[PDB]
Amino acid sequence: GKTVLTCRKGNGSIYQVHGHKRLGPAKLRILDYAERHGFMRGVVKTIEHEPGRGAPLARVEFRHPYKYRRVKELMVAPEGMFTGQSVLCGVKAPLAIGNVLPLGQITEGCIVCNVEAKVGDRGTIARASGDYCIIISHNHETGRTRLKLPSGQKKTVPSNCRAMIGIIAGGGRIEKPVLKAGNSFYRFRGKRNCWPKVRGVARNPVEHPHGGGNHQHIGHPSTVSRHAPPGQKVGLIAARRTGRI
RNA sequence: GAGUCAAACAGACGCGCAAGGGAGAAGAUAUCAGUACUUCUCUCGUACUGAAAGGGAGAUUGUGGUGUGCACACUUGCCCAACACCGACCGGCCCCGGGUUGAGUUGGAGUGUGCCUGUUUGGACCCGAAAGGUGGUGAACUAUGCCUGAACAAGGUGAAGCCCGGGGAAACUCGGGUGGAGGCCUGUAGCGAUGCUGACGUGCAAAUCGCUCGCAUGAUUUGGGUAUCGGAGCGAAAGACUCAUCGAACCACCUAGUAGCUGGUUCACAUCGAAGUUUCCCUCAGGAUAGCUGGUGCUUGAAAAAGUAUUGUGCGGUAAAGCUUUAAAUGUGCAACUUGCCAAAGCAAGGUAUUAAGGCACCAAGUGGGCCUUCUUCGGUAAGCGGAGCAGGCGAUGCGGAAUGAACCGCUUAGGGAUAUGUGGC
RNA sequence: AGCCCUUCCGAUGUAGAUGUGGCGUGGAGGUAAGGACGAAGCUGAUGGCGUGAGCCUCAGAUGGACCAGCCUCUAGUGCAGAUCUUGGUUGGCGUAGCAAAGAUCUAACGGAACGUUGGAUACUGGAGCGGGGAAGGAUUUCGUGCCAACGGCACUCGUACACGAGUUGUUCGGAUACUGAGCACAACGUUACACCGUUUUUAGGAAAAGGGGCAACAGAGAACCUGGGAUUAUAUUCCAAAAAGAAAUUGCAUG
RNA sequence: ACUGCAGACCGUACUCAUCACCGCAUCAGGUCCCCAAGCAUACAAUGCUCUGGUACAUAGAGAAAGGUACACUCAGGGAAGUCGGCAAAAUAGAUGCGUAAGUUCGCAAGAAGCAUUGGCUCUGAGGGCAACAACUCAGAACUGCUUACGGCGGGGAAUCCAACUGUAUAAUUAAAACAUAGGUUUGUGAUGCAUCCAAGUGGUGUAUGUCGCAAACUGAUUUCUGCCCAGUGCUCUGUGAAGAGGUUCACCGGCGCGGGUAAACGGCAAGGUAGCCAAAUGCCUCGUCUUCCAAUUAGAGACGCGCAUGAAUGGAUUAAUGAGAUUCCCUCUGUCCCGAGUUACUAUCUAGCGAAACGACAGUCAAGGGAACGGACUUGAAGGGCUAAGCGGGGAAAGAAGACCCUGUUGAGUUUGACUCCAGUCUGGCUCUGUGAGGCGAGCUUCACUUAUCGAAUGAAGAGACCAAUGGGUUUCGCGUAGUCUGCGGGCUAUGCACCGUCUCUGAACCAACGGAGUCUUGUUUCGAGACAUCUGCCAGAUGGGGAGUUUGGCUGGGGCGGCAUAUCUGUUACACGACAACGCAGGUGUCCUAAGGCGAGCUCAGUGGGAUCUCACGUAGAACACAAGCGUAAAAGCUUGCUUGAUUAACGAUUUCCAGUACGAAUCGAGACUGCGAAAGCAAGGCCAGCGAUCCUUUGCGUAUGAACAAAUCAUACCAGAGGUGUCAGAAUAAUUACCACAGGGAUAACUGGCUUAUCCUUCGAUGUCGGCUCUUCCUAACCUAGCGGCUAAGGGUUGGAUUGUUCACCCACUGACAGGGAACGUGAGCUGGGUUUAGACCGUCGUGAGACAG
RNA sequence: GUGGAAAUGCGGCCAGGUGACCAAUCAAUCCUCCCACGGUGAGCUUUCUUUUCACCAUAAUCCACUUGGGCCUUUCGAGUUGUUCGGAACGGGGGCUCAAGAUUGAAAAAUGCAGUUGUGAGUUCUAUUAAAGCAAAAACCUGGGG
Ligand SMILES: [Mg+2]
Ligand SMILES: [Mg+2]
Ligand SMILES: [Mg+2]
Ligand SMILES: [Mg+2]
Ligand SMILES: [Mg+2]
Ligand SMILES: [Mg+2]
Ligand SMILES: [Mg+2]
Ligand SMILES: [Mg+2]
Ligand SMILES: [Mg+2]
Ligand SMILES: [Mg+2]
Ligand SMILES: [Mg+2]
Ligand SMILES: [Mg+2]
Ligand SMILES: [Mg+2]
Ligand SMILES: [Mg+2]
Ligand SMILES: [Mg+2]
Ligand SMILES: [Mg+2]
Ligand SMILES: [Mg+2]
Ligand SMILES: [Mg+2]
Ligand SMILES: [Mg+2]
Ligand SMILES: [Mg+2]
Ligand SMILES: [Mg+2]
Ligand SMILES: [Mg+2]
Ligand SMILES: [Mg+2]
Ligand SMILES: [Mg+2]
Ligand SMILES: [Mg+2]
Ligand SMILES: [Mg+2]
Ligand SMILES: [Mg+2]
Ligand SMILES: [Mg+2]
Ligand SMILES: [Mg+2]
Ligand SMILES: [Mg+2]
Ligand SMILES: [Mg+2]
Ligand SMILES: [Mg+2]
Ligand SMILES: [Mg+2]
Ligand SMILES: [Mg+2]
Ligand SMILES: [Mg+2]
Ligand SMILES: [Mg+2]
Ligand SMILES: [Mg+2]
Ligand SMILES: [Mg+2]
Ligand SMILES: [Mg+2]
Ligand SMILES: [Mg+2]
Ligand SMILES: [Mg+2]
Ligand SMILES: [Mg+2]
Ligand SMILES: [Mg+2]
Ligand SMILES: [Mg+2]
Ligand SMILES: [Mg+2]
Ligand SMILES: [Mg+2]
Ligand SMILES: [Mg+2]
Ligand SMILES: [Mg+2]
Ligand SMILES: [Mg+2]
Ligand SMILES: [Mg+2]
Ligand SMILES: [Mg+2]
Ligand SMILES: [Mg+2]
Ligand SMILES: [Mg+2]
Ligand SMILES: [Mg+2]
Ligand SMILES: [Mg+2]
Ligand SMILES: [Mg+2]
Ligand SMILES: [Mg+2]
Ligand SMILES: [Mg+2]
Numbered sequence A: 001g002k003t004v005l006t007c008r009k010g011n012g013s014i015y016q017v018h019g020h021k022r023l024g025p026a027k028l029r030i031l032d033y034a035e036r037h038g039f040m041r042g043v044v045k046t047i048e049h050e051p052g053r054g055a056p057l058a059r060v061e062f063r064h065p066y067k068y069r070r071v072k073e074l075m076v077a078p079e080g081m082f083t084g085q086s087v088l089c090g091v092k093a094p095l096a097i098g099n100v101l102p103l104g105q106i107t108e109g110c111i112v113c114n115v116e117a118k119v120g121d122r123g124t125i126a127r128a129s130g131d132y133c134i135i136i137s138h139n140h141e142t143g144r145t146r147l148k149l150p151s152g153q154k155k156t157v158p159s160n161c162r163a164m165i166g167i168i169a170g171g172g173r174i175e176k177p178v179l180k181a182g183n184s185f186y187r188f189r190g191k192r193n194c195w196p197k198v199r200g201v202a203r204n205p206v207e208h209p210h211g212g213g214n215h216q217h218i219g220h221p222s223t224v225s226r227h228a229p230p231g232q233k234v235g236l237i238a239a240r241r242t243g244r245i
Numbered sequence B: 001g002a003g004u005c006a007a008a009c010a011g012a013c014g015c016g017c018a019a020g021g022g023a024g025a026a027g028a029u030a031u032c033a034g035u036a037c038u039u040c041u042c043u044c045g046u047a048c049u050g051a052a053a054g055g056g057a058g059a060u061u062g063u064g065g066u067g068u069g070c071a072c073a074c075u076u077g078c079c080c081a082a083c084a085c086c087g088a089c090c091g092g093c094c095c096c097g098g099g100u101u102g103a104g105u106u107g108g109a110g111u112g113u114g115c116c117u118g119u120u121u122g123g124a125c126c127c128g129a130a131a132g133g134u135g136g137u138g139a140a141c142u143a144u145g146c147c148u149g150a151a152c153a154a155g156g157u158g159a160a161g162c163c164c165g166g167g168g169a170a171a172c173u174c175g176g177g178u179g180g181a182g183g184c185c186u187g188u189a190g191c192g193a194u195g196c197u198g199a200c201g202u203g204c205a206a207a208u209c210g211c212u213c214g215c216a217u218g219a220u221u222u223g224g225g226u227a228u229c230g231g232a233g234c235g236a237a238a239g240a241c242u243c244a245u246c247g248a249a250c251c252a253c254c255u256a257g258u259a260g261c262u263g264g265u266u267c268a269c270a271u272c273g274a275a276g277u278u279u280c281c282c283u284c285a286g287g288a289u290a291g292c293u294g295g296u297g298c299u300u301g302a303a304a305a306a307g308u309a310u311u312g313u314g315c316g317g318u319a320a321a322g323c324u325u326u327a328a329a330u331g332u333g334c335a336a337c338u339u340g341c342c343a344a345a346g347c348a349a350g351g352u353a354u355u356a357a358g359g360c361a362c363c364a365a366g367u368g369g370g371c372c373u374u375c376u377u378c379g380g381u382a383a384g385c386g387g388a389g390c391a392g393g394c395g396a397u398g399c400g401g402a403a404u405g406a407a408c409c410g411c412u413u414a415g416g417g418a419u420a421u422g423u424g425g426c
Numbered sequence C: 001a002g003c004c005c006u007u008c009c010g011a012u013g014u015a016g017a018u019g020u021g022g023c024g025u026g027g028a029g030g031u032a033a034g035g036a037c038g039a040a041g042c043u044g045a046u047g048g049c050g051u052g053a054g055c056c057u058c059a060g061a062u063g064g065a066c067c068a069g070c071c072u073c074u075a076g077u078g079c080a081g082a083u084c085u086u087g088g089u090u091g092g093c094g095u096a097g098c099a100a101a102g103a104u105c106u107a108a109c110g111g112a113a114c115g116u117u118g119g120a121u122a123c124u125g126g127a128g129c130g131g132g133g134a135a136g137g138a139u140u141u142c143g144u145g146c147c148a149a150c151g152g153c154a155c156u157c158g159u160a161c162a163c164g165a166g167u168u169g170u171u172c173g174g175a176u177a178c179u180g181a182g183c184a185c186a187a188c189g190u191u192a193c194a195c196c197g198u199u200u201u202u203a204g205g206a207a208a209a210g211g212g213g214c215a216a217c218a219g220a221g222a223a224c225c226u227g228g229g230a231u232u233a234u235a236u237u238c239c240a241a242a243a244a245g246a247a248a249u250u251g252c253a254u255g
Numbered sequence D: 001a002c003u004g005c006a007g008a009c010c011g012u013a014c015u016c017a018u019c020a021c022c023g024c025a026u027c028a029g030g031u032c033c034c035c036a037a038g039c040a041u042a043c044a045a046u047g048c049u050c051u052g053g054u055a056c057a058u059a060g061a062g063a064a065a066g067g068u069a070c071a072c073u074c075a076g077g078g079a080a081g082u083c084g085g086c087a088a089a090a091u092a093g094a095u096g097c098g099u100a101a102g103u104u105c106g107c108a109a110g111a112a113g114c115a116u117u118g119g120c121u122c123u124g125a126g127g128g129c130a131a132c133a134a135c136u137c138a139g140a141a142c143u144g145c146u147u148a149c150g151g152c153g154g155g156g157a158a159u160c161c162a163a164c165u166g167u168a169u170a171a172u173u174a175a176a177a178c179a180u181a182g183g184u185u186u187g188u189g190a191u192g193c194a195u196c197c198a199a200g201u202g203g204u205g206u207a208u209g210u211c212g213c214a215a216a217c218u219g220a221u222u223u224c225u226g227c228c229c230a231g232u233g234c235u236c237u238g239u240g241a242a243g244a245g246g247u248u249c250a251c252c253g254g255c256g257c258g259g260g261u262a263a264a265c266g267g268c269a270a271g272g273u274a275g276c277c278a279a280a281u282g283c284c285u286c287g288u289c290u291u292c293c294a295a296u297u298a299g300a301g302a303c304g305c306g307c308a309u310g311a312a313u314g315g316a317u318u319a320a321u322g323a324g325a326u327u328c329c330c331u332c333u334g335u336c337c338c339g340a341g342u343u344a345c346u347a348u349c350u351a352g353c354g355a356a357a358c359g360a361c362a363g364u365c366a367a368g369g370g371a372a373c374g375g376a377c378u379u380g381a382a383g384g385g386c387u388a389a390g391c392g393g394g395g396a397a398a399g400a401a402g403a404c405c406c407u408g409u410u411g412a413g414u415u416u417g418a419c420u421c422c423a424g425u426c427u428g429g430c431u432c433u434g435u436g437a438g439g440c441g442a443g444c445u446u447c448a449c450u451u452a453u454c455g456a457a458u459g460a461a462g463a464g465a466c467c468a469a470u471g472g473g474u475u476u477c478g479c480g481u482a483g484u485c486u487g488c489g490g491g492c493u494a495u496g497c498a499c500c501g502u503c504u505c506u507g508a509a510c511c512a513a514c515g516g517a518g519u520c521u522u523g524u525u526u527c528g529a530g531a532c533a534u535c536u537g538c539c540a541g542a543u544g545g546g547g548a549g550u551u552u553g554g555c556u557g558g559g560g561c562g563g564c565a566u567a568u569c570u571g572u573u574a575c576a577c578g579a580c581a582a583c584g585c586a587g588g589u590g591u592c593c594u595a596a597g598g599c600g601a602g603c604u605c606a607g608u609g610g611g612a613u614c615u616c617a618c619g620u621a622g623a624a625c626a627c628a629a630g631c632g633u634a635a636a637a638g639c640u641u642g643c644u645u646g647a648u649u650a651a652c653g654a655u656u657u658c659c660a661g662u663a664c665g666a667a668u669c670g671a672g673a674c675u676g677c678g679a680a681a682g683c684a685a686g687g688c689c690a691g692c693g694a695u696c697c698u699u700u701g702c703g704u705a706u707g708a709a710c711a712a713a714u715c716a717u718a719c720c721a722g723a724g725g726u727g728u729c730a731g732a733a734u735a736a737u738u739a740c741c742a743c744a745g746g747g748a749u750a751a752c753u754g755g756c757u758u759a760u761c762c763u764u765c766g767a768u769g770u771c772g773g774c775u776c777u778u779c780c781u782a783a784c785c786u787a788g789c790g791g792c793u794a795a796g797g798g799u800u801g802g803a804u805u806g807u808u809c810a811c812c813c814a815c816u817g818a819c820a821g822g823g824a825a826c827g828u829g830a831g832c833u834g835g836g837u838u839u840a841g842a843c844c845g846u847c848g849u850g851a852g853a854c855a856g
Numbered sequence E: 001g002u003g004g005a006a007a008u009g010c011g012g013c014c015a016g017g018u019g020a021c022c023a024a025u026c027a028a029u030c031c032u033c034c035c036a037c038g039g040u041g042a043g044c045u046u047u048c049u050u051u052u053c054a055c056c057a058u059a060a061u062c063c064a065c066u067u068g069g070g071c072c073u074u075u076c077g078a079g080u081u082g083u084u085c086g087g088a089a090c091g092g093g094g095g096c097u098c099a100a101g102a103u104u105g106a107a108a109a110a111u112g113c114a115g116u117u118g119u120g121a122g123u124u125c126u127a128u129u130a131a132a133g134c135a136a137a138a139a140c141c142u143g144g145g146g
């Protein structure tokens, strides 16, 4: 045959993220001693658009814990995070929007964003716009809170894990129809060479497992096995069910 | 410019020695990669057989016998070679003296070499694929992404916001302007490229020209830079594009790849001269096999002569006949003392017409599409049709004749002359 | 070229086989011989010989120095045909054409005979057959001469030929001296192997917190302007003391 | 401030283009940037002009046919032309009016449609700055028109498709395809998902984090997406024993079932729902009806026995959009009737210059024959030679070893539930792998531990302790208690002392004023997991077109399709020895039988007839003899019956058939043994004749041999004799597809082309352009009209224009005296046209698992 | 260091700024173009033509010093062609300051040219889509602190 496009994206050549104009990683502050035994006040300096990203990123400027210099630092913004706002990261941070305080100290039922799964990893869950995760339980005896991932998905993480308070900003992007082929041209301009998506049945038999034939049709089930070798694992992958739900 | 070189076999022919032949590597010497010389070995052979352990051939001072058998001898002998038949014997295998088996033996024929031919393999007579592999080179064309720049006349329509007004209980509508929106419109530039299926079409051009046309504020066009490629890259996806190369680039190499296929294969003359059929083959465009043919002989000379009769003796079941049976013609075959059986020594067996050189061996080629016709048929509605039988032809062959004709007719053929003819004519 | 004679029979022939004191070629061992009184080669109404391949002789008003015979050895040995290879030549044929973008005319001169100037006439028509640059080219530039060849006609002319010239910078651009998409040295790791990968390195990277470098002649950066009577050809580069001049700017130093 | 000195490197010419670059060139092609006048004008359109540049594109003379054109004009008609309004014409600027359906309310729209427009002399309007400037609009008279630059939309009504803009086969396809938004679905919480890499503390999505990413399908909106989970897919649920040992046997170690899923593949297990249609999907078929016309294979609209519609393999419907398909209309026209005239450049003739293709040889015909359509031959008929311009009939003209087709034990691309595999994935075991506490069972798991390992974070930036032990022992090294031990020095277990050990709704901040700022360390940077694995390595199993290599028999009146005539038997073909062919003809064959074999004996049968299964007669085989057929057979070879195993062994006996005089099979004559039957001779080593098979290997038997230093046992091997099988039957182990295709050939072999016949395969595959039309000529006559007769003669001349459809053909409308049939390579493509056929693109239906196929 | 009530005027590290990022439009200059005037040269000139054409130039550098914006201060309107704005300070008076610009002059008439200004137009430069938000960095600057 010939290499499938799903496999070629793994070369990550043409298919790499753009990101020249990206501001850098949008993370939480390094889990300092100050985070673990107090709090760091950083004022939000400016809320930026990172191209290719939905959520605005904030520019909180924490003062450096150990030296005379000030440490501007960039994290995806919770909604209502205005410039000049004083963020408070740390274990005994007050419970407010934008504050980053230990997950086990956040009240059960309150919704948090930019949650970190592993302790100290600097915020990986609930980072996309509009996204958040409600804390659904604490377990102080074993120090592991549960939380509901932005997908209907429960997950247990240590309470020492940081989280930010509130919904991530920029929510509701997806609600607006794109309408133009050109409009989606630009949302992916800042993302990657993801787009346009040619259908595999429109492709040739060399190009794709679905490709080829006179009427353009898949010839075999589109629901591929989990163990299917790459270049084969196209169509619906390890699908448990198909059909509209 | 195209059967070569090597090598391994084989037959034939030449040479050497011969129950042996020969060296090779190497050496030693004398004088020049030669010639001369030789040890020691090795090698093929003289012994074969069996899977193997193993065993291993003379007869009753000499052909094992017998049959047919040159020459010579003598008036039949001996028979050479040779064939055949039979022993015995060696090995192996058995049976209960017998069978049988070997590429055995039976007074060695091998060997080295030259040379030709044949087989094989190698580039393999020469030339030719589509490919396969190995490794490199390419994103200047072009595909895509990114960086960073550049570009886009003149109109048109006229969105949101805004502003003024009229109406309304309110409700928020109706004028009018404003404004300049849009993968908006017309249309430059630019980017394309629909149509004329226009020009051109050995062109200006290995894709161009003309007019027409499409997009032309956008998913636009464009420079530079940069990233991604060959079982790979890139693709709004046409298997498109990846330097005029893409259903797998280009370069080099393996590689003179392979070809049962196509094409070619170079002096003369003389001597003979086919086959297109048999069996077998993943065989059907090819082989192997046998036949046909050549060469070499060998062997001896009405030997085992015969595409023919006659005579004698078989065979037959087609035509005709007949109502599935009698039976042609053309054919077809053939001929010219010792030791079993018996009751026993008698039987059995082995022994004291025309014409014409016969047989045998070896090696080898081409061929293995046939065609026509005669007669006979089979299939087909029929055919310049498919299939067979017979014989003859053409193929491979003219010549004479049928005006003409591959195969009809006559006749078949060295270079010529006379004569006379053949078919055909006058 | 059969030792001679006599008689008899045969004679075609594709594929193929075979024969041949058969032909012929390059070379070798021999022999014999030839050649500047002309070898080979080549030419040939030069005949002669041979069935033939061919040989021989003659003649060159050809050549200029090698070489035939014979026996033996050898082979890269004989060609009308391979859409054969290579070179040359040919018919077609002085033909097909040299018809896209409107265009020249005149006189004078030049010249051995198209140019030059004047005039006339048009054209381009500022998205130009204009004036500068990138890429690319790299002497094409300029002058003199030349026009053999080339400029598909012609040339007296040329981007052609030959000869001689020509490109001037504190400030232009570039580098010195930015970063960018990116790249990759180092180290480290992987690999049978570094010609791989990350791009910082399980890592002690300071020599007086995160190694070194590169990557934009359109991005960032960037101190200079005009006048010239200054060239055949360069000028924001040349100019000379009244620098035509006027500046800005960097370094050091100086009062 | 000044002044003084110094200010280095390289670039620098020219070009930047119908002659300087790329394109083999001074090539009409291509190639980034900058500056860019005047007038008309809305203008960078277009025309023209100053400046700057050109006058270089070979020229001349003249003005045959035919051409090219970025040239026109054409009476009357007006699409009749054609496949098709192709091409041309036509519309056109501005202003004022006016503007339909339909619609997503934006549009449609420049809809459509009328109307006015010049010149001139005037008027009006519209501003600025203080105490002169535009130039548009408007109006008015008067007057003019030859309707007189350039430039500038033709319009409308419908159907199909796609929603739209877009993209896209560079060099035949710009589409209806791709994209698209929108829709759905799948995976997935980072230990991830997809995925690159040979490999790694490697890489991509991911600079990310479910409003994300990765994978698919559908394809805007509106509307709807029915039924089917049966298939398929996806998903989910080492240890013992024997043995001397090799070894062998045994025990434990992801599937099956079951469930779910169709916006999975698909069907309509379910039986096609809503819809929609002779639709790009309907064979029949030009369906039928209606509408459109004079006429309609067209169209539109209905209808629905739908060959073979139908629902995200999306259904339907859709305004806007469209160089999309299609029908009609108005306008318009040289498309046409039916051509004519003009132009300019060609051609023509000249000066200069100067190829190519092609080239066997040539080159008048008719007939003939012939490789079956001759330029060479036979026989006739022509023909003096050489020319110039045309021309396109022939030269089966040239072009290219036919892209078609077939063949080849040739390719490649694709597919796959072909064969063989290989990565990937997952699973398992082991390993990595330590330590404590358990329990269970005869080293397994729970549970903690932590130093391996793993993950994470970090610029390794603050861990634990001091709060004190089922803790430590080198300045703490030591004591005391009980138990035991002793190398007499102490040890060890328990244990307690000590000691290790101890302190408290954006401002600014640093560069310290022994400490200030705690000390300590059986160390780990921290955090998490943790002997698990997000770990290593190795084996294992499954999966695995993701990829790879390979194959995908033959024959065959081409191939495929089947058949199999691919091995064998009978009758026939077959022609009175033997042999003899055809996808020739009629049948058979792979078996079957302990008996249906062997033997003996007895017997007689099929059927007919006479009587009542029987009885008698006759009874030439008319029956039976496994099996098709032939043969043969009567006290039998049949039938019953009895006894039986000769259907054994058979020393390698020889032979026949096939034949090559090889084999296999089959069979015949034998010999030896031992039998069987029979009084006996005799008969029997199967059932006559078809019923079956190498090498290698496996296996079984049998009677010694080898395992080569020796020996025995095991094992293995060997000899020898059977068996397992190659049915393609003298024996590879083998799926499709290609219209994207390719090569070597083939006229050995199709379509095609002539011939023959009424299909053959003769020519042609190093190529002879297809149907049709148009155009033009010509010939025939089984005469349609005309003419003469009375159906016959008669080939003379003529035989129409249209609608539908590519057509031919047919059918229609109209005319006509009539609208005849044919030949000429189904006349005529270096004459055209290119509608049909029509390669690649694409769509639909059906077929196919798929790639792909369909003479739809 | 220093003036000013103020806006502000003059004389290591750390943080910020410049670099630095938009189509258009509007405005100013620039430039080109036109016109008017005036000069100068040339040309037409049968006739006509107070005429037609050309030219009338002003470099960087420096020195003194109207439009747009920001700000200081003082005591419903404001605003644009345009989608604004105002007690978080609108308007008015005075002031500050930036950005362009004008004029005064130095350059510089010793140049250019050849035998003048002004006026009009154009050009020039200095929001929208956005699920698009439209580079970096050295250099350099200024500060805070020392
Ligand atoms: Mg496709
Ligand atoms: Mg595939
Ligand atoms: Mg589809
Ligand atoms: Mg489909
Ligand atoms: Mg021997
Ligand atoms: Mg060869
Ligand atoms: Mg050979
Ligand atoms: Mg080759
Ligand atoms: Mg291969
Ligand atoms: Mg547009
Ligand atoms: Mg248009
Ligand atoms: Mg395709
Ligand atoms: Mg003969
Ligand atoms: Mg052949
Ligand atoms: Mg008979
Ligand atoms: Mg008869
Ligand atoms: Mg004759
Ligand atoms: Mg002869
Ligand atoms: Mg030689
Ligand atoms: Mg002559
Ligand atoms: Mg040779
Ligand atoms: Mg000519
Ligand atoms: Mg002009
Ligand atoms: Mg020059
Ligand atoms: Mg030169
Ligand atoms: Mg970088
Ligand atoms: Mg650099
Ligand atoms: Mg620059
Ligand atoms: Mg510079
Ligand atoms: Mg110059
Ligand atoms: Mg220059
Ligand atoms: Mg230029
Ligand atoms: Mg213009
Ligand atoms: Mg123009
Ligand atoms: Mg007319
Ligand atoms: Mg018409
Ligand atoms: Mg018509
Ligand atoms: Mg017609
Ligand atoms: Mg047209
Ligand atoms: Mg309406
Ligand atoms: Mg479309
Ligand atoms: Mg194309
Ligand atoms: Mg589509
Ligand atoms: Mg939809
Ligand atoms: Mg459905
Ligand atoms: Mg209809
Ligand atoms: Mg369907
Ligand atoms: Mg379009
Ligand atoms: Mg061929
Ligand atoms: Mg074959
Ligand atoms: Mg092969
Ligand atoms: Mg017979
Ligand atoms: Mg009997
Ligand atoms: Mg035998
Ligand atoms: Mg046998
Ligand atoms: Mg039998
Ligand atoms: Mg066979
Ligand atoms: Mg044939």
Ligand SMILES: [Mg+2]
Pocket (backbone or CB within 6 Å): none
């Ligand atoms: Mg025809």
Ligand SMILES: [Mg+2]
Pocket (backbone or CB within 6 Å): none
């Ligand atoms: Mg023709």
Ligand SMILES: [Mg+2]
Pocket (backbone or CB within 6 Å): E059
């Ligand atoms: Mg100045």
